[PDB]
């Protein structure tokens, strides 16, 4: 689901 992509991105940018 395309609408889930930015969540994956926020979870990586928060672990750095």
């Amino acid at each position: 689901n395309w609408f889930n992509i930015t969540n994956x991105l926020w979870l990586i940018x928060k672990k750095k």
Partner: antibody
Amino acid sequence: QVQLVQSGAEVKRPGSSVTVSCKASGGSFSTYALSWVRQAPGRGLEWMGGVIPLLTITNYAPRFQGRITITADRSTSTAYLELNSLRPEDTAVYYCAREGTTGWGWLGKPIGAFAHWGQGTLVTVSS
Amino acid sequence: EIVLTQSPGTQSLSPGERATLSCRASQSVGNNKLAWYQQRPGQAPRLLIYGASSRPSGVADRFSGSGSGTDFTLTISRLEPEDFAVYYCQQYGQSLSTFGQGTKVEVKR
């Protein structure tokens, strides 16, 4: 904040192209999803497609594929909708919408649904 | 493609009454990714509820969402004059997002 400001009204002929811009200002731009939604006169909301600016990962509604292009310029925080082969049925108010975050914003966790809207852009297609 | 079907087309109520709006989906909506928007006459729509039951801050406590799978409901507990407007549902549980045709809530006189 996060405010979306769109370009002004357009009048187009059948067969031509239109490009509508949306300027984001207040949050982060690259990592949040921006969608385009239109509303034809006297009708409801219809989702056209969107873009995640970060890798220009696009997502187009099947009935628009071949006619639509969605871009984003990370250096100006501006998204663009381009629609070609225009027809009178494309007469509508076009909105850009950015997804909300848990915040209420406060650049945090994205929520999918559209918390932020542009003012709308009237595109009229006629001869 | 998921078809969302809102009922009824228009709903007539008096201020202070309780409004409950329905949305039914042709298929199951994944992870309850269902939202409700309000649109006043000359305005852009405004998000009221997401993920079926989550309310953004700033949205009034009158608004609440419930439901799952195939059957969703928006409730306004005490209608304020500002609330008589059009309401839309949207599913975003697959890449092809869709909207319902909308529901008008008119003042009953």
